[PDB]
Amino acid sequence: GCCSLPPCAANNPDYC
């Protein structure tokens, strides 16, 4: 999922 994936977490600080 997003929050455990570096590129995704960094691009979605609002969610993660």
UniProtKB/Swiss-Prot annotation:
Q: Which GO terms describe its molecular function?
A: acetylcholine receptor inhibitor activity; ion channel regulator activity; toxin activity
PTM text? Both tyrosine sulfation and C-terminal amidation are important for activity and structure stability.
Q: In which tissues is it expressed?
A: Expressed by the venom duct.
Localisation: Secreted
Top-level taxon? Eukaryota
State whether keyword Secreted applies.
yes
Instruction: Name the GO cellular-component terms.
Output: extracellular region; host cell postsynaptic membrane
Which cysteines pair up through disulfides? They are 2-8, 3-16
Outline the segment boundaries, as ranges, of region: Ser-Xaa-Pro motif, crucial for potent interaction with nAChR: 4-6
The Cysteine amide modification is found at 16
Marked site (Important for inhibitory potency on alpha-3-beta-2/CHRNA3-CHRNB2 and alpha-7/CHRNA7 nAChR) residue numbers: 11
Sorted UniProt keywords: Acetylcholine receptor inhibiting toxin, Amidation, Disulfide bond, Ion channel impairing toxin, Neurotoxin, Postsynaptic neurotoxin, Secreted, Sulfation, Toxin
Q: Which InterPro entries match?
A: Conotoxin_a-typ_CS
Q: What does this protein do?
A: Alpha-conotoxins act on postsynaptic membranes, they bind to the nicotinic acetylcholine receptors (nAChR) and thus inhibit them. This toxin blocks mammalian alpha-3-beta-2/CHRNA3-CHRNB2 (IC(50)=7-68 nM) and alpha-7/CHRNA7 (IC(50)=253 nM) nAChRs. It also shows a high inhibition on alpha-6/alpha-3-beta-2-beta-3 (CHRNA6/CHRNA3-CHRNB2-CHRNB3) (IC(50)=11 nM) and a low inhibition on alpha-6-beta-4/CHRNA4-CHRNB4 (IC(50)>500 nM). It interacts with a hydrophobic pocket between two acetylcholine receptor subunits. In vivo, inhibits Ehrlich carcinoma growth and increase mouse survival.
Tell me the domain comment.
The cysteine framework is I (CC-C-C). Alpha4/7 pattern.
Q: Which family does it belong to?
A: Belongs to the conotoxin A superfamily.
Q: What is this protein called?
A: Alpha-conotoxin PnIA
